[PDB]
Write a protein that binds this ligand. Sequence first.
Ligand SMILES: O=C([O-])C(O)C(=O)[O-]
Ligand SMILES: O=C([O-])C(O)C(=O)[O-]
Ligand SMILES: O=C([O-])C(O)C(=O)[O-]
Ligand SMILES: O=C([O-])C(O)C(=O)[O-]
Ligand SMILES: O=C([O-])C(O)C(=O)[O-]
Ligand SMILES: [Mg+2]
Ligand SMILES: [Mg+2]
Ligand SMILES: [Mg+2]
Ligand SMILES: [Mg+2]
Ligand SMILES: [Mg+2]
Lengths: 357, 357, 357, 357, 357
Amino acid sequence: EVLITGLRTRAVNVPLAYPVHTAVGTVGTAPLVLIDLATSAGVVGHSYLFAYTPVALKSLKQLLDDMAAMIVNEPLAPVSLEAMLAKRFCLAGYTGLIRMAAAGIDMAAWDALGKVHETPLVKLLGANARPVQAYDSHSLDGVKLATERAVTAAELGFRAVKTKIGYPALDQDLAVVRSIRQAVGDDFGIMVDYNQSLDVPAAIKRSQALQQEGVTWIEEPTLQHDYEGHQRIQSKLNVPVQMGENWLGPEEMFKALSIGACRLAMPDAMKIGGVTGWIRASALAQQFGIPMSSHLFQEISAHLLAATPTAHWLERLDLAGSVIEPTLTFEGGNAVIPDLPGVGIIWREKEIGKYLV
Amino acid sequence: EVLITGLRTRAVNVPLAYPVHTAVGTVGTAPLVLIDLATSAGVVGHSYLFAYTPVALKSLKQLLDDMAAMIVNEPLAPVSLEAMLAKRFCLAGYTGLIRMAAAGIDMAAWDALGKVHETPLVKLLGANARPVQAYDSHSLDGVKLATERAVTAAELGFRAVKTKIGYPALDQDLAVVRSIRQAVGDDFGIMVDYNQSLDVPAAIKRSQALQQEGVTWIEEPTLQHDYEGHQRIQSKLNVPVQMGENWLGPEEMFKALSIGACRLAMPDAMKIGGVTGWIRASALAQQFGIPMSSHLFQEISAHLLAATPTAHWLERLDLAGSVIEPTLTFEGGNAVIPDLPGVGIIWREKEIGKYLV
Amino acid sequence: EVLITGLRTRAVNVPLAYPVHTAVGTVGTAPLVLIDLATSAGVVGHSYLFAYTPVALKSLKQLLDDMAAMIVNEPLAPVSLEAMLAKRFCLAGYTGLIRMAAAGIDMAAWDALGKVHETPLVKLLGANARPVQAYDSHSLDGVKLATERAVTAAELGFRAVKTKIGYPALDQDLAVVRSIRQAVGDDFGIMVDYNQSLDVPAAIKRSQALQQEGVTWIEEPTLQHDYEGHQRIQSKLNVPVQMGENWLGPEEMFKALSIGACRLAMPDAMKIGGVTGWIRASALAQQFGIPMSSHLFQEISAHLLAATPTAHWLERLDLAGSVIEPTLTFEGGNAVIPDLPGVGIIWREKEIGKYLV
Amino acid sequence: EVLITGLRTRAVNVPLAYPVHTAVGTVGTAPLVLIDLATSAGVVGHSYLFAYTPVALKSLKQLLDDMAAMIVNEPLAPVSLEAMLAKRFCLAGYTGLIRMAAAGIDMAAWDALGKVHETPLVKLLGANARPVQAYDSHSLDGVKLATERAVTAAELGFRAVKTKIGYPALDQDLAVVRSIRQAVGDDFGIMVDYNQSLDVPAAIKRSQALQQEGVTWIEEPTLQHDYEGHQRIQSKLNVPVQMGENWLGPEEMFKALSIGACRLAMPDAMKIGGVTGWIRASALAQQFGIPMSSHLFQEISAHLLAATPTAHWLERLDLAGSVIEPTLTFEGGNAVIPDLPGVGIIWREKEIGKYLV
Amino acid sequence: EVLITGLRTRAVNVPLAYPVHTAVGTVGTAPLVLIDLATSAGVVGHSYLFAYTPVALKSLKQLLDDMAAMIVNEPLAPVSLEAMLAKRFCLAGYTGLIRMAAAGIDMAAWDALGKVHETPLVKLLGANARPVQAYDSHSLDGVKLATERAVTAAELGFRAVKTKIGYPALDQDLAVVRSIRQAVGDDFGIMVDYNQSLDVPAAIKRSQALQQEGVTWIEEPTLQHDYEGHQRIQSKLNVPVQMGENWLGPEEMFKALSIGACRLAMPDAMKIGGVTGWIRASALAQQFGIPMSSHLFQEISAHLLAATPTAHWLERLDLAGSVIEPTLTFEGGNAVIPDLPGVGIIWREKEIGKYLV
Ligand SMILES: O=C([O-])C(O)C(=O)[O-]
Ligand SMILES: O=C([O-])C(O)C(=O)[O-]
Ligand SMILES: O=C([O-])C(O)C(=O)[O-]
Ligand SMILES: O=C([O-])C(O)C(=O)[O-]
Ligand SMILES: O=C([O-])C(O)C(=O)[O-]
Ligand SMILES: [Mg+2]
Ligand SMILES: [Mg+2]
Ligand SMILES: [Mg+2]
Ligand SMILES: [Mg+2]
Ligand SMILES: [Mg+2]
């Protein structure tokens, strides 16, 4: 009985705090698609998608625009909407850009549903808000900048940071981790992210060296789809292998956990299938005994982690801060959900116009 | 913010329409614990528990009354409440009667949350109401009564019935199924339930003979906890093995599905862990590719199945109709969710007094 | 040395000979993206993509146009180009629409390389042209039309047809297959396609009944990504399960074959990763002992199957005949590769204008 | 339409730089069979076989001579030729000397096909030439000569060397590795090769000792056909076990990788089945996540590795330098493919006459 | 002490009684290498090899002649000689033609050792002579000839025959088996041989149809090296899959039995590694519970089967009768070992001259 009455998309290329350098390439600004889902109840649901590369940005906006035909005049019932989209895209492939688009709709539909009920999303999911520990996510920064960023994060109350590694030599990876460690002390988390950049033997060699140094987890050591390879790496380590940012739907998470690819998981709220997909992922992580963190999407992930039985860490990487009001706050390194209906995303309407593509 | 302010229980032994004879003993009236969860918002959540045998009825009410103090003044946040109860009962064993008591609290809490938002439970879960196909659940009735009840059900619009089997002779099981089939035709479901009454070899022999007759599924052929034995029985059959009414929590479901015990599942809304546990179960059934039906608890199961990705059948077995208003209806053999906030359970307050233990 | 100098795409919605009705919806005209790859040698490579639904058509063209800048000035070396694209799209997700776009580039690049060498693609791959047996692919046509089309195909020299099944009743599936079989005899192939429309238990029941009738294979009985479910269905059948049209890349094929999902494979030249991906797939099918057929893309698949060690059947389903010259012919039910350089695709330039979106 | 018009073989015993001592025996000169495949296009394909021991040299030449009857007047289509030979030798056993002969034909046929198209082989395979890192392959040289050969290699720009080990005592293996390491520094690869000389327990003991020293890989620790044994050794190591030089066809590689025998592979261009076999192997190594190096045959392996998705190292061991012009060069320790049609093998016709058998 | 003093080989192409037509080509006369092993005790060991195709005949003789120098002056100790040859050929590959050559040496060495001790080979192995049941091995003969030969064999006292199948149509396979069965009755063995001619799905379909007819075993349904495929075929059958004639060494047998490829085995005395290899094989067949028959080599196989714990059938297919005296006899369908020292092979010296290549 509340119906969707409109879908609007805006493509933007927005400025970050610091360019996200990785072992496989740099992201400087962020290409986002901002989504507004109008309803018969007046309220408007807000979400956004991350396109990764500007090469996919227009394509992703166009796909969503064409997908409006499937959702306008449908009831605002995200679980029912998701089943419908899965069926309509059965042939095309309910994965990749299509799935990402479907997840943007889901996230905006749950924001609207929270607004219909004048309640924060975390409460609509049946949970209480609580503070959620966050790590500050950095990049392939070199020794000097990595160490500076770590010090600043520790000063702000974060109890962990993540750096991106996969320099040409193992010794360069180790020099960065060692430098951070000396600056932040032993009682501090140092997560490291390979961004898929190693083959299995190289990953075993580098990871056993990092384990000796002392790191909190080793993220995506090899090609993301190679769950068997991740299992073989994890088999040679005490430190946990972390992955999951690239899982497209809970069905891909299921395949990975079924063969023991990793001891930690970190679904992406977009790629996993939005709120609907996230809650399903949550249930899998619980049964498989996997502590579950987030990947990007810090605004909605604060809510979702509060409803996740094995919640572990929130990834602080603020891609959309230039266009979303800072209603999510951090106190003592913990994310603090705002007391606002739905997700608590309010657009900075005058800023968005600066960045439209 | 909205808080639980009180808990009241009433233990009743209520009359059914027809004693539930099984191969392992018969349930002639139903022992129930009726639950009222008061809240700071003025609304009262309603749920009930089934104690199976009167021997466990007073014990279950006593347990719930002694749990009032742990939930009074807690937020009405069913997911957060479930986590607290799991932790409190870590030592005692969060299973059996304790888990059943937790599930009754969960179901009444979700009823109350629907009421707080003035919305049916199905919509609060993010799904649309839809009619759900139901089968009429009968008992170890003999050829004459079994065939009469089947015809009556078909007359009323049901497209399937379940009968309880496990007579002293296989020939008797087959005689009942044949006489039903003659009276209802080939385009009709006949589910059969062994209620754990056979050892593995006996189950293989009886089930392959039933399979030749044409039945829709074979339910609980052996001891419910023996997942490996259910796997061995399934390995010898084309017809699906059905089980799950006795899983205490989604963790037991996960263990059974992980070894291939069955090709169908039917969780019990109480034993699975209420709404919270059911939603977890539904995620598991989706990933493992298992069509998921309900067991008893028809009032809440109509809502839950509408939010279940692999929803299969609703079991119609009306245990509580003597004390709950008939707001759930059946049309054309489909359950129709009432348009009422929460679950739509309203007590028949003048009838309850008759049945107090 | 030979370089790509440009990329042009045209999005069309083209008329078929007969709408493709499936159990999960119907494809009434075909949305295609036509690709022209210009090179420094003067020759132009041609390929096309199938977008399945018009909803994805503009998005796919947009994506390819935004990929021009990454391939312009690169060498015309399809293997090296594929590696570059895999790396560039590591973060976004090298799957779904992105992977499909990469595959269209690959197919046009191999067409261009054949042209550079003035040699049919089959010979450039190191194989001899040979006729390849083809089946004529029909749709959810009903008893009358299905039987007519089967007779017509048999009259024309085809030795097999495929029909789409998954009618509301199993009896209807069986009625269609029986009426075909009566019209064509026992010495004729009848493949059947469920287009992912059944859950595992339903697929076991329907498939064992079809198996009694005599069918050649059962294609995509359940959700395409559910390899474990396809294994469970295959485990109950003598007839081969066929799948693979929905594998995105050889890595998905490898996962499916590694767990015994099917006893036949049919990769899609676009989803498998073009020629580059097809040749990989062919190596896998050889080792796993899986006879390998094609899915759509008949123009290029005739070349590719001639270089496939376990080549089985070519699927005749002419999606692009309204815009491509009929240089591929069929004689005695066998596809005959034209003696033209590259793939032998030549555009009907005056027809394309009619169908532009 | 280009046909094979002749096959010529020449058996030679040619001089090496240094005798190849192994733990299982010494190779001084090299017994080779030189193969010329004449064609209707005028061009002549060149390849060679390595016979390992002079005991097999005449046999291998005679077999090829008798195999001429199967290939003369056939089309120059290596993939089609390979399928034909596999069928004709189905009964005899398409392995061993037979398979080696078939691979010599394949390698010469692809050289001819490159020549027909006036293009280097790497380009005909769809890839770009790039430099490929090479290690210099030495022998069971003792401490003094091993150290001298390593120093000379490092001076020439090689970044790794391989020594052959399996001296009577483990301490002798370790003394050689230690001496090299001191001479070349920590940032240098030291590969070691056992040449099948240890049983599994001895291999676990010696390899864990070598791992402590620091080596790059441990090659063929036990009997080559014992894939289970290799798996058991690899299970006790962090350092990768390398094998594959003895795989006769991709089918043997498949069997080894299916059970986890090794974390690195190094097919032999002859034994694996030539170019055709190599490309199939390439596809397997990619899926199984195995970095893939070459074994001998440096001339063609430079081409092949440039088309191998998981390319790792080229083995520099110049068996045929006395009879093939040095068109393959090494710059900075990288092999540099010559810009010549086909493989770039040109016979030293006046030298061949010195070495004929 | 007793030493080998010389080796002589003669390559012959000998006439059979009836060309051996198979689904994969036909063997019209037999190419054999006849072996004479001279010793310091005055006695000469005799054996022969089968080269399958004349293409390999000269190569095999050449190889053996070039192996004379490695065995001359070695002790006549077949086990110690086999170990030496395995080590010498470690690099070349102790398989295929090389392994076959080693096996001919082994068989002639055991013949010589029987002669040294003046005792039949069976007694030297520690067993008693006994008659061994034999089947008469026929070819792809057609309904008329197949049925004639079956009757002739039954008339002579054989209790089973083998026919070669794999005609273009399954109906033809079935027509041949039915016409045999009609002519010989139900109390008679009909073995069928596919000679590797079918892919796995084709083999499942053909074999289940043959199984309905009643056959004794199904031999080599698919590619001989594909043990996993033979397992998949066996998994669908009640009738036993038979294989093993193509195992090169007991190590290949071990790999096949380890994965459940077959429920019967039939090693070839030459390919399995002669007497030495056969005795190893017999130990494996015993442990794995596999009834073990012979393949060709009837003269020596009668001795070997008498020492085989799970001895099943001797294959009567007399390849060498044109050049070996008929000292092996058949009575009542059983092979009778002659009372002669060693194997009982005596050359027809005046006939050999007729058949020299
Ligand atoms: O931050 C991450 O974990 C990831 O590497 C990303 O940047 O998308
Ligand atoms: O619980 C029951 O009464 C029975 O086992 C059922 O399935 O309905
Ligand atoms: O894609 C299709 O239209 C169908 O599934 C087929 O197999 O042809
Ligand atoms: O060099 C090698 O890797 C191998 O041992 C050989 O010499 O053939
Ligand atoms: O080798 C053969 O001729 C045949 O395969 C047999 O079993 O006899
Ligand atoms: Mg990451
Ligand atoms: Mg029951
Ligand atoms: Mg299909
Ligand atoms: Mg080596
Ligand atoms: Mg045979």
